[PDB]
């Protein structure tokens, strides 16, 4: 009869890049989503299934949460059917998405000085990305007709590539942190409730 | 709209530097090559310099080694480009190209270019 | 350093007439050129990328085609407004180079 480590999720102190986005599987909680619900820190909150005040009474078998960082201006990219680098190279939801999504400004925390070269995402590949494929695959993908021998060169160098985050930078082009919640019924009981 | 401005220019003395930039508008610019060909008044195109991504790999042709520079700023989303120790021969019309954008599409949208010269 | 060959370096024809320019390699490229137009003052264009696709807004009338040495560009039929000269380049090894020149006049 534990609660659910939110705290230690959403408040922790360091995130993986979008290509390398992590995982942590949750479960087995009492759960209150209201305290986030309900924070009005958050600069952002969709989702698409169930309402937030509908799910918060209503019990639960599993439950994943993964997280990373995009741009502000690509924000709406993390949604069912939609387009651009994110969602083809890096991250995309599929159609009949069920989980939760949030998202806040995090210029305060994530943004350096001079440009933070931690966080990278994925450029170009020879097909579209399936529902939740990770590609930690840095291969020099060859388009040209020469072999490739590892080496960046004239073709097509890796597939990874780590923004500005300049902080002097608009809205849009600033970091968003982002957690992806994931709501899935199967055929064991109900694990999360209120 | 998908659009590439290109710096000033004019006359130089010979042997003479200056600076071109290419700004950018429409795409994010950290995703693309860059490459920048000239054309003398009428005569045939002539590749010159090619840079990849990350200003990690550079590339000159024979003739321009050693006098040509290239250079990136994602921030900014404006590719520049130094030239020192210019000889009479390269007055063109420098262009601003990409290269093998993000779908497959090589030598896009490359835009209007800038005059420059050498005379006195 | 591989030399490129443009024929003919000139033509004219009327409305409605088909002409053909021609390409010609030094060593093997595969599918690997373009065809580019310039009208007189302004920028060049992509028109046919790797010798054998439509650039998406460019009118169905141009079409070209071959592979590994010798290839050849088509016009279906002029238009008082296609009188510009046209280019080719090559695509795949580190230097790359362009073609010779061609220009298409419009005949009265």
């Known amino acids: 009869t534990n609660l659910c480590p939110f705290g230690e999720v959403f408040n922790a102190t360091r995130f993986a890049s979008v290509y390398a986005w992590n995982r942590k599987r949750i479960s087995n909680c009492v759960a209150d989503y209201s305290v986030l619900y309900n924070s009005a820190s958050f600069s952002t909150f969709k989702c698409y299934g169930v309402s937030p005040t509908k799910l918060n009474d209503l019990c639960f078998t599993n439950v994943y949460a993964d997280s990373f960082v995009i741009r502000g201006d690509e924000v709406r990219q993390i949604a069912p059917g939609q387009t651009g680098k994110i969602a083809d190279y890096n991250y995309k939801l599929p159609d009949d998405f069920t989980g939760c999504v949030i998202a806040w400004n995090s210029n305060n925390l994530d943004s350096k000085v001079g440009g933070n070269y931690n966080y990278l995402y994925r450029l170009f590949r020879k097909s579209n990305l399936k529902p939740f494929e990770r590609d930690i695959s840095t291969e020099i993908y060859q388009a040209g007709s020469t072999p490739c021998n590892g080496v960046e060169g004239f073709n097509c160098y890796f597939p990874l590539q780590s923004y500005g985050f300049q902080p002097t930078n608009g809205v849009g082009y600033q970091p968003y942190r982002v957690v992806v919640l994931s709501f899935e019924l199967l055929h064991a009981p109900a694990t999360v409730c209120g | 709209q998908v659009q590439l401005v290109e710096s000033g220019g004019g006359l130089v003395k010979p042997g003479g530097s200056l600076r071109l930039s290419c700004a950018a508008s429409?795409?994010?610019?950290?995703?693309?090559?860059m490459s920048w060909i000239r054309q003398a008044p009428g005569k045939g195109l002539e590749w010159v310099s090619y840079?990849?991504?990350?200003?990690?790999?550079?590339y000159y042709a024979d003739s321009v080694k050693g006098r040509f520079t290239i250079s990136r700023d994602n921030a900014k989303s404006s590719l520049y480009l130094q030239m020192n120790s210019l000889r009479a021969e390269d007055t063109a019309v420098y262009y601003c190209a990409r290269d093998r954008g993000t779908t497959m599409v090589p030598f896009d949208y490359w835009g209007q270019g800038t005059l420059v010269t050498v005379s006195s | 350093d591989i030399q490129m060959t443009q024929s003919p370096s000139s033509l004219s024809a009327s409305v409605g007439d088909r002409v053909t320019i021609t390409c010609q390699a030094s060593?093997?490229?595969?599918?690997?050129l373009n065809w580019y137009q310039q009208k007189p003052g302004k920028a060049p264009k992509l028109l046919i990328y790797?010798?054998?696709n439509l650039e998406t807004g460019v009118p169905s009338r141009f079409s070209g085609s071959g592979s590994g040495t010798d290839f050849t560009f088509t016009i279906s039929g002029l238009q008082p407004e296609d009188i510009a000269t046209y280019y080719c380049?090559?695509?795949?090894?580190?230097?790359?180079?362009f073609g010779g020149g061609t220009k298409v006049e419009i005949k009265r």
């Open positions: 429409g795409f994010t610019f950290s995703d693309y090559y």
């Open positions: 840079i990849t991504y990350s200003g990690s790999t550079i």
């Open positions: 060593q093997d490229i595969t599918n690997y």
């Open positions: 380049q090559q695509y795949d090894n580190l230097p790359l180079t």
């Open positions: 790797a010798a054998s």
